[PDB]
Structure formats: C-alpha cells, structure tokens
Amino acid sequence: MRRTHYAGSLRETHVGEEVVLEGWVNRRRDLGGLIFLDLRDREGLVQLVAHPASPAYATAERVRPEWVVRAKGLVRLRPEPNPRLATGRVEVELSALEVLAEAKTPPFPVDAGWRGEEEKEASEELRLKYRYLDLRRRRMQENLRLRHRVIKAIWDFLDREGFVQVETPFLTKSTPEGARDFLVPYRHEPGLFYALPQSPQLFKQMLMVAGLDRYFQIARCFRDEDLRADRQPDFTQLDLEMSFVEVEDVLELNERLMAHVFREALGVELPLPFPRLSYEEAMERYGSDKPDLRFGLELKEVGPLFRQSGFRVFQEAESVKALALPKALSRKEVAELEEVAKRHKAQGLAWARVEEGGFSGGVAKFLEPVREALLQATEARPGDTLLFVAGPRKVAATALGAVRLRAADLLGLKREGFRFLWVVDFPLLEWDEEEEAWTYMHHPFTSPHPEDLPLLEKDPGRVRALAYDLVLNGVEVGGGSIRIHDPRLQARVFRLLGIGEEEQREKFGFFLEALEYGAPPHGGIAWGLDRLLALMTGSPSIREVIAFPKNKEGKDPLTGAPSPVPEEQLRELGLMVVRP
Amino acid sequence: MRRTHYAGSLRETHVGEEVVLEGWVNRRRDLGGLIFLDLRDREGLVQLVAHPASPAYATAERVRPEWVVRAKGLVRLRPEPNPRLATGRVEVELSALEVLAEAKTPPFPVDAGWRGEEEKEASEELRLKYRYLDLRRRRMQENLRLRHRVIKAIWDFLDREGFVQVETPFLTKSTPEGARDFLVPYRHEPGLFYALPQSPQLFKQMLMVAGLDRYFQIARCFRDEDLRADRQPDFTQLDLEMSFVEVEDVLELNERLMAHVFREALGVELPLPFPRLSYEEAMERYGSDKPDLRFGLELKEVGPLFRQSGFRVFQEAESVKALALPKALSRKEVAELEEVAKRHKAQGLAWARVEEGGFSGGVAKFLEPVREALLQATEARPGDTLLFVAGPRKVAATALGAVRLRAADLLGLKREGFRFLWVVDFPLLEWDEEEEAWTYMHHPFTSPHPEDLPLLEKDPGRVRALAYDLVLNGVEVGGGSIRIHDPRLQARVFRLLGIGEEEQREKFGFFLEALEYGAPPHGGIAWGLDRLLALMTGSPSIREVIAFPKNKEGKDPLTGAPSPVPEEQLRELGLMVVRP
C-alpha cells in the first residue's frame, strides 16, 4: 500500500525508480494498443502507460474518470516531453494497477484545470451542491492552499511579534457590529438564548484589561444580514488588539504584517508604508471611503467655475464634480454611466470632449467660457472626455464616485496588482434616517479624537474618531480603532448613541465594569480574511476561497441546511413555530 | 509614550539603562521615606523605587493596586537580590511616573501569583463573573500562553508534514457524535434550522473525497449534553484527516505530533512509541478503556485459584479480580473502597494483608491454601494489602478498576508526568439499553475490521472496529478511526444502526452520494484540545485553560448569557416559547 510519492511530484530525476502512486483517474485514452491514464492527486498529473503485455492492462482497460487507483510502475523518460505539465518529461510504465473505488459520472468536469487548460464555469448552485467534487479542481485547491499559507504566515508573524492567540466564546452575549444576531436556544430555560458573536470585540478588549498586552485570533463572525458576493452569514476575520498603542502603532504593525503575508503567500513585495487618505479627501477625490487606486480619474470640484453659467444645473447646484476619462465613451455607455449616477441620488450626468483647442459634445458650449480654468483644474488633455455630476455635496461626490468605478470597467482601464490604503479620520457617528438619531460609524467602543470632546454635544456629527479602514483595490479589507478606556466617556458616548443607563447595564454592564478596574489604553483592527483572499486570488466572490460556503439565500445546497427538525426536538427546547 | 521593555523582562544585563515601562501596580509599600512599587505586566514584576528627591515621589505616593501607570527610571542593581523574581537582581530608580488609569478595589487579589507566592483559590463563580480580572493572575496567563504555544506547535508540525488547514462551516447540518444539537433559527422560513457542528466529521471526509490529502483544523465543536469538569458545551478539537492510510499511519503521525507539542510547549521528551492496549486488555488489566498508567496496581484474574474455595463468593463467581496495594488501608478507607465497588454493580470488596510468610485480616484464611500461587499471580510483597472483587467478568473488572483509582488517591500514590497510550481494537457497536437496539461505539462512519464483516448482520457485538482512543493519565484526550469509503458498506452499517433508507437520505444523503464519486481510503482522529491542555498544566478542569468558559449550568456569569430576547426579535424568527 503506502505510496512512494505524490503523482504530480515526479520529475526527470526520478527516471529508473519503481514507484507506487495513489490517486484519481483524471483521463483515460486508448491510443493504439496502448492505454494512457492521467493519474492525479493534489500535486498534479502524471501520465501512466499500460502495454498489453503488462498485467496492469486489463485493469487500465476497465477504468473510468474519477476512479481511485493504486498504480505501480517504472518511471521512464517521455520520448515526447509535454511542456504544459510539471511531470511533462516523464511517465510511468505500469507493472500493476488496482481499482480502490469506482465513481459515478460527475455532474461537471474537474480535469481541465489540471492540464492547464481553461475551464468552462458551471452553475454555482451546481458547484455548491457537489462542492466536494468542485474542490477537486486545481483552482479551488490553489485557493484553499493559499488560505492555509496566508494563515500560517499570520501566525508566524504575530507569534514572533509577541501576540498571544486567544480563542473567544461562540455561545455568548450580543456584540454590536451593526447586524442582527443569530440565536441559539438554551434548553434548560426556554426563552433564554445565546447569541453567536458578530465579532470578538468586547472579549479582545477584556483581554487587554486582563494584561495580555497583545492578542489575535482567526475569529469566525456571525451576522444575520443581507448577503452578497462579499458577504457570508458566517465569516472569518483576522482579529487583533494591542495595549499602550496609538493609531500609528496599529497601522505600522498591520503593514509589516500584510507585507509579510504577501511576500510569503504570493511572493509579492508590498511597498511600505501604505498611502493614507482622510475620510474627507477620499470622499472628495473618489466619492467613497474605500477608494480604488488602481486608476486615476480623480474627482475635482469645479462648482466655483460654474457660479454664473448658462446652464441651471451647474449654476444652482451646491457642488459640481468632474473627472477626466482618457478614452471616449460610446453613447450606450454614456447612457449607462448616466443610469449609475441616478441610482446614487444625482439628477443626471454630463460630459464633453476635450479637443485640441476646444470642446465638442454634451455641455461643451458652457465649458468654452471657462476652458483654461476648467482644463487647469482637471488636467484634461486632447482626446479625453470630461464627466460631470452636480447637486448637493455628498451626492455629487458619491454619484460621480460610482460612475468612476463603472467607467474604469467599460473603458477597461488597466487595473493590475494590489493597491492598499488607510482611510483615516472617520467621523465618530453617522446619522440613522429610518430612526431620527445618531448611531456609530464603526462600533460604540470607538474612541473620539482626544479633542472633539467638547463638540460631543455641540455638534455630534463633527466629531472625529481614532478609526481607520484598510482598503485594497476599492474593497474594505479591514477596520479598527483606538478604544475608549475611560469608563466615564464610554457611558457618555453610550447615552449619545441613544442608550439609557438601564440598557447599558443589560447590554454592556459587565464591560463598563471591566473598564473601572484599570483598563490600559488599547486599540486594534480586524481584517475580513475571506475578502482579502478573494482579492489575493482574483476571485469574483469570497465563496471561491471558502471550502463550503452558503449561497445568496444563506442556504447550503450541499447538505440541505437549513432544514426542518422534528417537533419533539424543538419541543424539548420549549420552542414552537408561529407559522402562517 | 512607547515603552522600552516589558516590566518583567528587566535583567542584570540592563543595569545602567534608562527605561520606560508601562503596566499595573501589583503592590505599593511605603517603607521609610522610600516608596516601592511592584510594576507588573505580562512578563512578570519589577520593583520600582521612588525616593523623596525624585519628581516621581508625589505620584508614587498616590497610587493604589491595579492602577495602570507609565514609569521612567534608571535600572540599578539591587543591594539585596530577591531569588523569587526573574527581575530579582534589579530594580528601577524612578525619575517619572504617570497614572494612566485608576482602578477600583478588585473583588479578589491577583498579585500573589506574580510574586511566586501561593494563591487562595476564590470562588469559581466569582472568578468567572470577573474573568477579566481572573485572567490577570499569572497561572491563568501561563495557561493561555501555553495554549497558544501548543496550537502554534501543531501548525508548525502539520504544515511541515503537508497538512492543509481548512475551515469548515458552523451553520450546517447535524453530525452524530452522540449528543444533542444546538440549533440556530433561520429567519426567512420559520421552522428551518441550522445546527452547530458536533464535529467536522462529514466535512473532513468530503475533503478527502475532494483529493486534498491530509487536512487539519483547530475546530470549535458544539454538544448540548450534560456538563462537567472535562465538558463544555462549546469546546475545541485538533481535528485531522488523512487519505490512503491504515491505522498504523494515523498512530505514527499522531505520536510524532504529540512528541513535538510536548517538546516545544513543555520541553518534555515523550518516549515513543506510546504503549498500546486492545480494548479487551485495557478492561482486563485496569477495568477501563482509558487507563491511568501513572501507577501500577494492575488487575489480575485469580478466579481459577478459587474454583474450590471455602468462600462462596470467590467460589461461585465467574471471575475474581485482585490487585495489590503497596500500603495499608484504614478501616474507613476499606469501607469507602467497598462503597465504590458497590456503586459499580459488584456485591462487595474483599481484602487481606500480605504478611512476611502469611496473610492476616479480612479473607486471609482462604488465601493461605493458595498462598504461593496467589503471591505469584499478584507479585504482592510483605507490607502490601490485597484487594478482591468477584462476580461476572465485566463487573469484577469495572468495579475493582474504579476501586483502583480511588485507592491511588487515598493512598496518595505518587502519580507524576504524562503516560499516554492507545486503546485499539474497540468493538464497532455498543448496546443501547433504554432503546433496545445497537448504536455506534464512536460514530457511524467508523469502519468495521476488514474481516469481521460476516459477523456483521450475523454477530453484531463481536464486530471489531478500526477505531482507537488516545489516552493520557486516565483521560481520553482523543479518538478516531479509519472510515468506511465504500458507499454500500456505509448504507449496510446505517441499516444495522437502525436507520432506514429514507432517514439515510434526509440525514446523510449528501454524504452517501459523495462516497459514490470515488472516495479514497481515509481515516483520522480528533484530540480534545481543552482536555490535553488541562492535563499539560495540571488543571483541575478544562475551564482553567479556556479564556472565557461556561459554568456547569452552561451559563456565562461574566456576560449573563444566555439571556432573554425581545418579543419583536423572537417574532421575526417566527418562534414562540412553550412548555416542553
């Protein structure tokens, strides 16, 4: 039994050796009297050859794709090297072959990728229903193995930096991360529930109050919220906290860590330190707090330039933001971008061609009377086309910010590599419109900027937080902040967030008490690990870097969960379904 | 701000350096116009000294226990070194001291352990209620940091052996491990529930079906079952699976893994290979499938010595188990061990002292007629006491077995170090008496011995399983098996387990179907990581090696979980509370 090597590990150096391989029949080809079988295992393919003389022939004759076999043979040099395979120079002449398991015909192929050939995408629902076969594809294995490598690299780095890995509870008390809690009924007292954690937040802070100076965990978080390609109800974060630190210490720690991860997993060198943008200029220059820096097209305020201009939209509007495309837009594209701008609360979109001494279409007429001031502000050249969106403040920036992303796609602009950036100076709060009150921008335990303290009642929304987001290619891959460690301030900010003394006691009593026993200053961050890996593998969604993810409905096609349970069982938990 | 060293790191090599330390005031001593503060942080204590001529004095005068401070000073050599502290040869002469956070008086002290003194164990319900202060104690931090070291050692080793770490789902389908599932209500369709995993069993096997080749995971597990000192409702396993292996392969891999963990985490060299005992030998020699080998008192069959004895009990019993105690028992103790034997279905216990040349006490007169054969069989020596339990086979063994354990306590038998062993050749099944049918001894996917197959439908109960438990100091720290990879055999065993073709479909259909797509032979094991660590740290329960555990009722006195939730919340899940 015991194999001597991994099928896909055989190289020229192995010629002459008798080997025992174990794997799956990737493909069978009857070519002449000979039978060639491509044996695969996780390290790749290797060609097996059965001659009619050999006792292995009868078996090689009966074999089908995905059948599991034990193969014994002599490694020989291929008279015809196959450049597309790592084992390409060699092949195994078979002396024996045993079938260990047969396999029904798979609902989709898994063989192409192992030959370097392109794979037709199968329906996701189908891939999910037979995830165990989907995970046989090379791309899927590369993804999981990269996930492994990334986490080991994180452990190696934080361990060396002195971090203590601590596992926090899953059957706990509710954590406010902005989402709904998944509940777990407590059998001995119907009506009582545990909440799965939205994050380890309160526990990692308590670990700081406990004197473990620095902590980390590959934490699983649960949030019963609306799901999309960057959202699973059950996800992973690289959670981390440090004591006696200031914003700089955290960000500096994270960059060295991230660069260690990219060097180790991708062999890519990240230039340090990462660029930084205040929440204002990121919102100014890109209409978003997770800027995609794989391309320019920066937003520019040109509202002053149109304070007395022929058309009313750029005249009446608070701000008019404009950017410059390096290529022209078709009129179906222009129509699209226009649709984009209106999905973001803006009236519409405007544009004009930048000629070699003038302007051409759209609103070019109104640009001529300001040509040298407008072309100065935009830096627009001849052959570009300017895009404009007017209206309020936020809306002009967000709308022309979204159209900036769409345009980069349509104009298929070079978007390669990784571009990280810290978005800092976020505002402490955020206005909840569906409930006429303030809520947290990140979470309630986020510390206000040491100064904006007075303004904490004068003007709630002008308060700066010691928060920060880590973004990669326009995706928020991490978020954290320095925490409030003074118990007074925490209850103050708690009141501001609308919670009364009594709710504070039911929801965070234990934690406010913890702050009174000598909490040191602390802060941290949490990366969305699934997101970071999706990006590191150029995957279209995080589902591609999770072994067994859920579909958009939060369901598991593979197992059938969530599924019904016998009445006796629910009854035993003192629960019953109020169904229609 | 930034400190220059960890308070507890200062050594003689640091004399003469100016330093910045940050930490907690472990204790304050006003000793004669001199103030001594013991500063503590994760790495230990340092003695800070404040002289009245120092700008630090006023502040050192105002501080209290558990206050967080920043201290600056010059490291000096102590005139009189304190042998009990790693920083004992030094002290730091303060030049500055700042209070960063005051603390209120702690409900229990946390300072003793850091001085190497002994701590009075406070109420566990109290330690739990303020777990963040409890975790300030040195022993708790040594426990958590040892857990970290152990997990990192597992990752370094398995990574080097080629194992892929894969994170498996928590909102998933039920997995049978012998317990009740914890459920999570799916809100978009009342009556539909996810089950937290009792283990990753089925996913780890499907991952073998997917061709990864060896997998592992530090997996959080959930079992709603009666709790106790070695049971938490949510615990951690080192979960592992391998393909194309036989029992020997899995055991060798685990032995080297475990050796590595001990070498790295404790600096202890485990002698390999671990001894092995079949289930039957373990029951014969110790009356337990989880022997504590830290002492002898091995059980001996001695029934054939009393087939014609004056004493009815030894005469008409199927077996007579004896053991030798190296010291004498008091009358109360003999009474206790007697009570212990009775609580295990045995009619009673018998004893007798082994005299130089004879026997005295209890049943000594019936021993004299076989004195040399008996002393032969028990290797008893003068000064010993022989213990006896008679009755049907398993009862004799089990009862004397339990008496053995209790006797080692009472006799305070010298139990030191770590004694591992593999208990192999478990039976495939185990009879369920409150059901009147067979169940699984481990779990349903456990493979029957390759040939006891006929005895299957025919002789259920005589069937051996390729299953194995790993035991340490009489505690089951791990369990696994080679699995069934043939889908027909799995269904056969499913039927035998009292599960009809239709239940098989709802509960394991996705899995049975997976075994039909070419599953390779595979097997694995799971360690109870909390149990391993409780044992590695000499802890009285696994709660001592979990940062935030539940108490025996499964409640969290720190947090208050589980707790009630608003009617609105329960309504939206379509659920309602009722009487069981």
Ligand SMILES: Nc1ncnc2c1ncn2[C@@H]1O[C@H](COP(=O)(O)OC(=O)[C@@H](N)CC(=O)O)[C@@H](O)[C@H]1O
């Ligand atoms: N549903 C989801 N599916 C997948 N990934 C998700 C999902 N939700 C979030 N993420 C990722 O987790 C990162 C951190 O989450 P936050 O809630 O911002 O931080 C927290 O949980 C704070 N306790 C961190 C801290 O303050 O230190 C996000 O940036 C994102 O990439």
Ligand SMILES: Nc1ncnc2c1ncn2[C@@H]1O[C@H](COP(=O)(O)OC(=O)[C@@H](N)CC(=O)O)[C@@H](O)[C@H]1O
């Ligand atoms: N409630 C609990 N609290 C704390 N520790 C626990 C608890 N229950 C179990 N353990 C520990 O985990 C080990 C493996 O669990 P098993 O159920 O034997 O096997 C399994 O789960 C199989 N899938 C393993 C396999 O076959 O690979 C036990 O030996 C024990 O130390």
Ligand SMILES: Nc1ncnc2c1ncn2[C@@H]1O[C@H](COP(=O)(O)O)[C@@H](O)[C@H]1O
């Ligand atoms: N199965 C047994 N094994 C050992 N000692 C026993 C057993 N049953 C009874 N004894 C002992 O035999 C003696 C007489 O028991 P009793 O007849 O109950 O008075 C007492 O020493 C009991 O402890």
